[model samples]
Every structure is written in C-alpha cells, then in structure tokens.
Target: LTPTEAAVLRELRLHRPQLPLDTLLFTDPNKDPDDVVTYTIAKQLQADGFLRLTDVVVTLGDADMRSQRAQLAKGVFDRLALPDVRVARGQDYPMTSTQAREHSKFLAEGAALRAAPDAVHTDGVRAMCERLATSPHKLGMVVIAGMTDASALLAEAGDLVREKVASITIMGGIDPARDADGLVQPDTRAYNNATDIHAARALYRRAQQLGIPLRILTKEAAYKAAVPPAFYEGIARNGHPVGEYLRDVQKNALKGLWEGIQANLIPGLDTAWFFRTFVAGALSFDAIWPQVTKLNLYDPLTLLAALPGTARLLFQPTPMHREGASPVEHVGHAEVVRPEKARLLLSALAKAALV
Candidate 1:
C-alpha cells in the first residue's frame, strides 16, 4: 500500500473501533462484463471482518430485466452459509417518465432456481429503509447497481432514508472535464444515470435535500483503476470457498460469452468481422475473452471505502445537476475521486485481498 493509503486506514482504525459493523450493499451482480467483481469483493469484505454478513442486503436491479441475478446472489450467500442474510427483489424495470414495467425471461428462470425457494425475500426499497430504521448502528450503503431501488426508497420513505443512512458510496456518475477517459458522455447521460434518468435525479436530489454525504465513483476513476488478470488468478487460487466459487463462475461466464459470440448474440458485430478479428488472430473460443480474468475494480473499490479501516480516496467536490428541474435543482456537491488516487486505492485493495 502507498503511504497515503496506509495513513487513511490507520486513521480509520483510530476513530472507528467498533467491530461487527453494520452496512447495506445494493448490487446487480450479473449485469455487465465485470459485474462478478461485486461477489468477490463482498466475500472478501465478510472474510476480513469488515462486514457483519448477516446484516448485509443483496439488492437487485432492472439491468437485465429479471430477479434471477438476485437469486444468483442468494445462491452465493447460501453457499457461504449466510442463511440469515436477506436478498431483496428490487425494481425489475427502470424508473422512467411513464413508470413502465419491463420483464426478462432470465428473471423467470432465476426465480425458479432450486435454491430460490430457500432464500429470504422482500421488496428492495422497503428492506433498505426498514433495515436502516431498525439497526442500532448507523448504516453505510454501498450501491453497485442502478439507482432504481434508491430512487424508490427516497420517494416513498425520504425521511427514513435521511435519518438512517450515515453515508452512501455509489458506483456511477462521470465528470466530463476531469474523467480520465471520455467513455461517459456529458451531463445526465452516464450509462447508469441514463439507464434511469428519473431515478438518478431523484437520488441526487434527495441526498442533497437530506444532507447525506454521498460519494460517487465516476466512470473515469473505475476505468483507470482496472485490475489485471493476474490479481484475479491469485484470488481464485487462494484456497477459499469464495475464491473457488469466483473461479467457477468466471469460467462459466467466459464460456457463455464465447457461445454468445459464436451464436451472434452480441449485437452490432457482423459474424464475418468477428471471425476475421478473433479467429484470424488464432484466438480459440477460450482465448477470445480477455476480460475473463481482468475484473473491473469499480464496485470493489467502493466496497473498500465502506470498510472501517480503509482510507478515503481523494475526491473533488463537483456540482451535480438535475434535468428539467428548478434552478435550485443543483443537487448537493458530489465527491468525485481523482483517477490517480483511485488507481493507488485499487492497488491497496488488491494487496489486502491477497493477505
């Protein structure tokens, strides 16, 4: 770990001595190419004693149009023997102007999983607010998924959300001028934000109105702090149950991707183009997936910050704007991490995981 990293962890330990810390984690674990990172990091955090496994909430999202990802998360928790941990089915559709419902066939399959019947279930927004109000300790929320659940919680129980949640660390947002890469477009169009603009706006606006300390892990910071494949290999070979499960899931995910490509399931790519680019390079079905082991540290880094003795990364206070709102719609100042600091933080987390 860097000196700065060590200093932050040290300070965190000095001030917060209470063990068995309580926190809530909201995630869509099966959403994207690197979403599995959420599962790996959550397991690491629990094993490190940074989280009270029983109190954590696995909140799902509409990213894939089903609650199957929620079921997959339940399977992980059950495998870890955390039967008391609650997995909530959140909004299955994005919060849009018209509030339409979008369903996915994958969700139906997930709901019918053999393990699904054994898992505890509840409404995502309600569970979040209820947990916050009931827990004796102030709750820290780690949101690795879209803000649909959050938006609903805020809209329905704004006061409870304000009083219960101590801090919120979100993996979204993009600073157009300061982000390392231009992957994210200008205002309100970030992938997560744009997915459900209404929800994003509600979350930021409510946080501002309630005076909650909200930290956003921007797109550029995450991209700049990408974890190498070697790090994942280390974890997979570490002789831990979570590590083994991660390895198996990753292998299956890669196989699924290869099949998707072969079947032309991936849009915007011509079959001939894919074959020429990949097969022409002598890349086998297994070798075609470079991201198989290269996990994105976005959600993992956010989870690290939520730990008791972890250092807070350097952040620039930036104004967040809400579209189609009053002039005062400048949601509170969002603390955006610097790319260099994020990279260093990721390195520290990688080392910690190995230990």
Candidate 2:
C-alpha cells in the first residue's frame, strides 16, 4: 500500500467521532438542506452526548451562496443556540478562476432563501486557521462540498492543518455505487468533486503530503439513507421547530430548483452541448433530478460518517489512489457496509431534528 493509504487505514482502525474533539465543517448548502441539517445535527449530538464536539467552524464554499447560506445557518444557530459554532464566509471562487457570481443556475435554486444582511463576512479561511491554532485538540474537519476553501486553507496554513486538523470526512470524491458483481455504476461522478476538480486535486496532494486521514463517504451510502418524502410530512405533523425549520427551507429551495429546471426546457441546438454542457454543467439534469425527486442526505451523511460511533456502524473503508478516474485519490472511500444501519441512523437523525 502507498503511504497515504496506510495512513488512512490507521485512522480508520479506531472509530473516533465519539470523542469530544472540536469539529469544523465546510459546506455549500446551495441546493440542499442537508448541510444545514449536518450542522444542526452535530450540535444536537453534542447536546445529547453522542458527540462531544466542543467547537465548530462552518465556512460557505461558493462565494455567491455565502450570504444566503450564512443566513440560513445563522437562523439554525438561533434555534439551536450554539455559541461555539462559528459561520464564516470563504473564498469566492475555485482555485482555477472566479465563477460568475450571478450566472450560476443553482443561484435560483436557493434564491428563495433570503440573504443575511447581518451574515458573517468573516474570512473563513482565516477563521479555520485561527480555530486550528487555538484549539487544544485536533479539530475534525468535514467537507460536504467542493474543496475550494479547503485547498485555500492548505495553501495558507499547511502547518496548522497538519498539526491541529484531524481526519477530514468529505461527502464527495468517492461513489462506490456498485452492482451485485461489484461493478461501478454509471452515475459515479461524485457531485462534490465535479464542482471543482482543481481544488479536489490540491486537497488530495496536500492531504497525502501531510498524511492526514481523508475519509470519504460515497454517494451510494447517501442515496440509501435517503429521507423519504413522508419524513418531511411528519415534520409538519410533529410540529417540531427544528425539523419544521428544515422543511421550510427545503420547500422554497425545491420551488426555485423546479422553476430553473423548467426554464431550461429548451433543447440544445447541438447534440454535444446537451450531453456535455447541460448534463455536466451547472444546471446538470442529474443534479436537479435527484434534488427534485428524492431527498438523499449527502452532507448530513458525511457528518454522520465523521462521528466515529455513527460512521463505524454505517460505512467501511476502501483505499483509493491517484491516476484513477476520480477527481483525486490517495484516500479511503468509506463505502456503505450496512445499508440498514444507515437508514436507522438517518431515521434517528430525523428524530434528533424533530426533538
């Protein structure tokens, strides 16, 4: 095994999320409520003693979605009343270039969610550095979206990340969707990695250099743990403020997400444009299809995967290396070892939110 693979195995050997270590989360809660769910659940776990994460740093990945997501996140903080969880704005664009602030289609998907005038404009990259430097324990980092901010953090403070950041649990980069014969499936392009390949490459390279365990949860696991539509109905029935708030957020998101899908109903003039650009572009069909049809918990599953107790029950690790078809490698794919357990855990999370 390569050095990175060996290091990953060592970290996986111990189920470590049950500890009271400080946690960090970098998310792009643009199209889904799961990242918000992830943060709230993390705090809920802390409240209920499932996880003892003393501190948390949340940074938005996309510059355009920062204010909206920050507002949504800050609202959750108001309800959850977590003083230690800090939300900071992050790098505006990917490492390669600046994305069009207003042109992205996903903007409409989350536009219903109002922007936060008082939203945290704190430099998230610096926030992460300061948190890592000050925290007495190694902070466990979870990346549920692209690696733009994460890569930026590494460039600025490699030593701090190496020294104080613990294992990183990412929602993308691995999609071990397999058939009965163990063949990989067609929809293997992990959405998070697809957002920005450059940042993902930088992350894997530096993670390998630092020997930090990069535990990656797969799309299949998240797909299996999908929250059925009825669960959202139950949130309304149960009338729990937490779950209700989440339901409220998702309602307007799907409203706009669907509108955007309809707005692009016109076919591409060129055959290649439809396949390559539309399907793989910002308003990808697959992306909108899943969000519209099903409620697969991607970021929340990543959060659960980071908590050792929860992760140990749901996923098992497989070593990944460079030169593969993925965005980057030299990491461990935390594939779902127990689909039933994952559903149970996700159901339990629903209750946690409802509670």
Candidate 3:
C-alpha cells in the first residue's frame, strides 16, 4: 500500500466506527520525565480512539554520557507493544554552540534509560519530510521539544508543510508575565524557546505565513495540569505497565532534579540541611521537596491541543498573530482554558482510561 493508504488503514483501525480521525506526528527531546509521560498519554489516547500517531522526531540525546533519552523514548512504544511507527533521531544539540554548555540540563539523571532501537538510523528532519511528502492527508503535528527540527522541516520542505500539514501545536514558553488580573502574558524566553531561539522564531513566522493553525501550551498553562505528588502512590495501582514504569522514572527524575538544585545552591555548605539554621536563612528540606519535585503534564497537553477532537477539551477559539500570535502571537486561544478538568483528565489517563 502507499503511505497514505497505510495511514488511512491505521486510522481506521485506531478509530472505531470510522470517525474522521486526524493523522498525527510528534517530536520530543526526552530530556525530562514529562516527555515519557506524554508518550504514554498519546498511546493511551490512540488506544481510546482519539487520533492515529505516526512518527516521533526525538531531539537532544547525549550518547556519550549514556543518557541518550531517545533510546528510552523508543523503548516506550516498543514495550507498549505498538508497531511500525517511525521513531527517527533528530538534531542532538541546541541550535547554537554557545548554549551547548547547558547540555547538562538534558539528563533526567538517566531516567527511563534503555537499550537503543533495532531500526537503522534515520535523520529526523529528512524522515519527517519523507513522511509528510508521501502521505496524502494533511497531518496534525506536535512539537514538545525544541523548535530546531520543526524549523528545519519548514526550511527543507516547506512546500510539504504548506501542502500536507494541518495544525501545529507546540509546548514552549516565555517566562510568566501577568496582567492586571495576574494572568500570564509572556515575554522573556524560557527553556524550550531559549534552546533554539532562531528555530523558534523561524517556525513561528513560517507556520503563520503557511496559514497552519498553531497552538502553544505555555509553562503557565501547564501548571494547571501539575501531577499531584499523590500520583506516585497510585501509579502502582494502575493496570497498565506504562504506569508502572512511569512511576519509577518520574520519581527518580524528580529526586535527581532536586539533587542537582541542592548541589548548586551553596558552594561549600550542605544546602540539603544547612549547619547554620536560624539567621543564615536556612530552610526546611522536607518543606520544599513538593515544590521542587512538582511535575506538570506539559507535553501531553500539546498533543491535546494539536488534535481537533481533544483541542476543544483544553483550548477554545481565540485570535493571536506574529510574535504573540504565531501561537505566542496568534488570532486565537493558545493556553489551556480549563485548569481543574486538566488535572482530572490527566489523572484519568493513568488510573481509568489508559488501562
């Protein structure tokens, strides 16, 4: 069968009763535990008849430190007992060499580490181009990592984007900026955007010019879906293995994240429990763990915004443009609108629906 034919067949099987399901593809850096959490969430969505997932453009893997989280990403689909979907490799570094020094942040202290895939190596940008060009349907796309490869795809095969892309949803942000009512209005660049600023700029501009609908689930919006610390305890109770594995990796990664913070907090002193307590501004080690270890369902929400069926669950029609509208600028809703339900549904992903 042709690529498009194969896609249609997959969609038919994934979608019961022949609903008009969107063909979706996505990318992730796999640096953080949220990446893994989102992957399982997507699979759970597909398993539940939401959308058909095709490819993953995995980014920023460090092979030397043996923490190339991309391998772990591949392992998720493989162990989930899913088949044939492409998990191609993507640009393995930040766009600029200057920001390359910050590579240490990419490791979740070997969270979810696994053996590499059996498939031959495939360059992600090229792979995305081939998939986009061959498929007949306009596909929904999600970028949960940096904008590097998404920008590269626009540069290399923009005609394909203009021809075959439907919607693009990104998980990135500027630092929290609040309005008169203390709502977020962003400006300063944050982690994902700062990783590849030029790529971020170009993709935002080009996707707008191409007229693809875009949504960005910002850091402020992700806070609404923050995983309850109580989630860890209940994960063991989840019926699926995805939950079992996530419970371990998520816990370990958050602990590792806190350890990194402690190491940098004081040069020669123990920040974990400082010797000078009363006036030296010592704080409670037990008190702050919850805040430091907090994990948000940031990546999965990007997937939710990208697909038509799920988009309405979190976002509503709103306008935005250029710098603020391209997603950050656009004509319509970019942030997730429902906070309480966001928490409720993400919890359901692990406990009820996913199993």
Best by TM-score: 3
TM-score of each: 0.67, 0.71, 0.74
Position 222, candidate 1: lDDT:
53
Residue 318 Cα positional deviation in candidate 2, in Å, after optimal superposition: 1.4
CA-lDDT, candidates in order? 0.54, 0.59, 0.58
Instruction: Encode model 1's per-residue lDDT on 259-291: one tens digit a residue.
Output: 666666865655465444333333465566553
- Reference-based TM-score, model 2: 0.71
Question: Mind giving the per-residue lDDT tens digits that candidate 2 earns over 191-302?
Answer: 6676666677667567656767777776656655566555565555666565665676576555444445456654333434333322233554436434343466777777
Give the distance in Å from residue 300's predicted Cα in candidate 2 to where it truly belongs.
1.2
Evaluated against the true structure, the overall lDDT of model 1 is 0.54
Model 3 stretches astray by more than 4 angstroms: 1-26, 61-67, 92-98, 104-113, 174-188, 238-241, 256-294, 322-335, 352-354
lDDT of 3 by residue, 147-212 (tens): 777888888988888889877777765434433433223333656676667677677667776767
